[PDB]
Design an enzyme around this catalytic site. Structure first.
Site, short mmCIF file in Angstrom:
data_model
loop_
_atom_site.label_atom_id
_atom_site.label_comp_id
_atom_site.label_asym_id
_atom_site.label_seq_id
_atom_site.Cartn_x
_atom_site.Cartn_y
_atom_site.Cartn_z
N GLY B 18 96.67 89.25 -0.19
CA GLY B 18 97.35 90.51 -0.15
C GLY B 18 95.94 91.94 -0.30
O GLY B 18 96.73 92.07 -1.80
N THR B 19 94.70 92.72 0.39
CA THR B 19 94.77 93.39 -0.27
C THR B 19 95.45 94.82 0.34
O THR B 19 96.33 94.80 -0.11
CB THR B 19 93.57 93.34 0.67
OG1 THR B 19 93.38 93.18 2.67
CG2 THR B 19 92.08 92.34 0.56
N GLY B 20 94.87 95.95 0.44
CA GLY B 20 95.04 97.22 0.69
C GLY B 20 94.92 98.47 -0.21
O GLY B 20 95.63 99.34 0.04
N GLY B 21 93.27 98.55 -0.14
CA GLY B 21 92.99 99.57 -0.93
C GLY B 21 93.24 99.45 -2.87
O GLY B 21 92.92 98.64 -3.24
N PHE B 22 93.95 100.51 -2.91
CA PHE B 22 94.47 100.88 -4.62
C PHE B 22 95.08 99.30 -4.98
O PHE B 22 95.23 98.81 -5.71
CB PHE B 22 95.40 101.32 -5.00
CG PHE B 22 96.50 102.41 -4.28
CD1 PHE B 22 96.43 102.87 -3.24
CD2 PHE B 22 98.20 101.94 -4.84
CE1 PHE B 22 98.04 102.81 -2.44
CE2 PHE B 22 99.18 101.63 -4.83
CZ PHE B 22 99.06 102.32 -3.21
N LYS B 24 96.39 95.14 -4.39
CA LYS B 24 95.88 94.11 -4.87
C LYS B 24 96.98 93.17 -5.42
O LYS B 24 97.18 94.05 -6.48
CB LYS B 24 94.32 93.82 -4.70
CG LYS B 24 94.27 92.26 -4.68
CD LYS B 24 92.92 92.66 -3.59
CE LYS B 24 91.74 92.52 -3.88
NZ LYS B 24 90.74 92.52 -3.14
N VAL B 25 97.61 92.42 -4.54
CA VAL B 25 98.83 91.07 -5.13
C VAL B 25 97.99 89.66 -5.20
O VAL B 25 97.58 89.14 -4.52
CB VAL B 25 100.21 90.92 -5.14
CG1 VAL B 25 101.39 90.21 -5.61
CG2 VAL B 25 100.54 92.40 -4.52
N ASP B 128 113.95 104.69 0.16
CA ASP B 128 112.85 103.22 0.72
C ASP B 128 113.83 101.92 1.61
O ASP B 128 113.29 101.01 1.18
CB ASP B 128 112.21 103.74 0.15
CG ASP B 128 110.58 103.30 1.38
OD1 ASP B 128 111.27 103.58 2.87
OD2 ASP B 128 109.36 102.91 1.51
#
Ligand SMILES: COc1cc(-c2cn[nH]c2)ccc1C(=O)Nc1ccc2c(c1)CC[NH2+]CC2
Ligand SMILES: COc1cc(-c2cn[nH]c2)ccc1C(=O)Nc1ccc2c(c1)CC[NH2+]CC2
Lengths: 322, 316
Positions: B18-22, B24-25, B128
């Site tokens: 799981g990428t996504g800028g700041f 990551k997992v 949320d």
């Protein structure tokens, strides 16, 4: 309502995403049967960093290469942007480096000739990547590297528009394509050493090390390796090796004895006729205007089906839809 | 690498999921226990949000809240070592099938209710709640995530009073969101949906929705108690926990109280950490009781889970 258009074309599987804005959703393209990966962004959650998504799409629409992770399809719903991308189950080059110790010279070369192929082609098209690091390179189901994340980008001879610090060129930190060459040089060092040439506890001490540009040359590095490293790790970007000279460098040609083939094997202007004929039997019309239609490169379903058909033809399996 | 040296003393790194800028997992193994873990790696990009989440997760401990074990801060990174959740998002579950049955949605909803009732007991409101924020562990048990927007989101889930400027919140807005969640589980799509965001807001304010033919009258009654446009008229948590829909097949109300303690400590675990450290014992217990969310907090809580899965209370 956000998935209605996507789900006409793709059967959604697992979630190698669940990241921030961008989850990756492994998916199957229904017509061809080929595995795709689906990058999903939130068009009103992404903050003031929607320009990054648009800089990437517009660079990937113009770049086509065996060592660049291909864009097949862009979909924009109310609150979602979808990117249909090439299948990379092999992990990051980063995961590769941190599992083993350090790589041998001949092993790093096998890898490094693929980084050089991709980045040289990027530069030919007027682009500079600006965030080359081992996270941004992925392995496909055939063990070949694919370059990703053009979120930062160039046209250095274009209209006015940073990354990881340990990879950032000196001139970048103090404010071209030569910055990418420095970053391939950092990459070359870590592959062969298992550690960065410049590393520290604080960020302020990291910058000072990049500017001075002095580094350790380990005992196990060959003199050919050392020579190429100092040509690439020049603090003055005018003194740095050019791409024309990198492609056919003596270290670069050891055991291969031909230079790096950078030119794309994935064409924009030539249309494969096995794919044009199969799309024509499916859509039911004449191949003359069928070719004219593909040539728009709208990155809709027709672009996805054409390029995935071409990928299936490349595999060895037949040129067939349903 | 200097950013990974401290982490890699404790964890063997696996899959880069799981990428996504700041944010990551990465999947990881905790070396001492052998227990699997998920690691959230921040590129130190809204760091009040990372700090609200860590602060809320340090104080919340619950069977249906995704557990924090360990916080690590290097030069350019923040690491969160979190509970293993291989089962996907409740979102992925809903969109693979068409819609769930009432009894299938009850099993699922009673866990959401157990978690949210506990959040509210500790003085928090999540803000949320959606099916992307509920994950399945390896036992098919839900774990609530992302307290980055919590106070002490998605518009289709946002309460009417939240959209137009509160005056003020917070717990009744969560109840509305559980009501949206309840609807999607049973219908296979939202009570308020549109092409534009401006038309979505107008639908939430008037609050009129479609009631599908297959929804039971029990389902309909609970839906209208939760989907009240006036937040004073909305069902209270005290009444939600023992609601006739909530109890239909279960002989008993929702057990919200935590089964994961801060104060009471497991002795079997304590005597295994003592043999490792070569400490006395009164010291050992006093030390765990700091809850510093270092390696000792990670090792204690993962030893507690190993103890629970049937394997022995033994370190490697
Ligand atoms: C997590 O990424 C993947 C996992 C698998 C996979 C895992 N297991 N099996 C297959 C297969 C493919 C991918 C993939 O292609 N992801 C991807 C493509 C482009 C970009 C990114 C990711 C990062 C975000 N920024 C834009 C660039
Ligand atoms: C992104 O994944 C997670 C996020 C959080 C989290 C986020 N915030 N707070 C906690 C907590 C746990 C996970 C997690 O463990 N996911 C996971 C585990 C195993 C596998 C996968 C994912 C990929 C699918 N294939 C099987 C392998």
């Amino acid at each position: 309502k956000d998935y209605d258009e996507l789900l006409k074309y793709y059967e959604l599987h697992e979630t190698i995403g669940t990241g921030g804005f961008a989850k990756v959703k492994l998916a199957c393209h229904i017509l061809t049967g080929e595995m795709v990966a689906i990058k999903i962004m939130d068009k009103n959650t992404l903050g003031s960093d929607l320009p990054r998504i648009k800089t990437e799409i517009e660079a990937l629409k113009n770049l086509r290469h065996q060592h660049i992770c291909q864009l097949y399809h862009v979909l924009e719903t109310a609150n979602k942007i979808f990117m249909v991308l090439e299948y990379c189950p092999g992990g990051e080059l980063f995961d590769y480096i941190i599992s083993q110790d350090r790589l041998s010279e001949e092993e790093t070369r096998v890898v490094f000739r693929q980084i050089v192929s991709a980045v040289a082609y990027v530069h030919s098209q007027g682009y500079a990547h600006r965030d080359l690091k081992p996270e941004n390179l992925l392995f496909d189901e055939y063990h070949k590297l694919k370059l990703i994340d053009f979120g930062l980008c160039a046209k250095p001879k274009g209209n006015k528009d940073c990354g990881a610090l340990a990879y950032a060129a000196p001139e970048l930190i103090q404010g071209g394509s030569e910055a990418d060459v420095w970053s391939m040089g950092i990459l070359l060092y870590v592959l062969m050493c298992g550690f960065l040439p410049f590393d520290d506890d604080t960020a302020a001490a990291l910058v000072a090390k990049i500017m001075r540009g002095k580094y350790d040359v380990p005992k196990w590095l060959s003199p050919s390796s050392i020579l190429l490293l100092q040509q690439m790790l020049q603090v003055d970007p005018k003194k740095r090796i050019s791409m024309k000279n990198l492609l056919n460098h003596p270290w670069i040609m050891q055991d291969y004895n031909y230079p790096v083939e950078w030119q794309s094997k994935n064409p924009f202007i030539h249309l494969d006729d096995d794919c044009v004929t199969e799309l024509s039997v499916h859509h039911r019309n004449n191949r003359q205007t069928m070719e004219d239609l593909i040539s728009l490169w709208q990155y809709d379903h027709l672009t996805a089906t054409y390029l995935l058909l071409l990928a299936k033809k490349a595999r060895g399996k037949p040129v067939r839809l349903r």
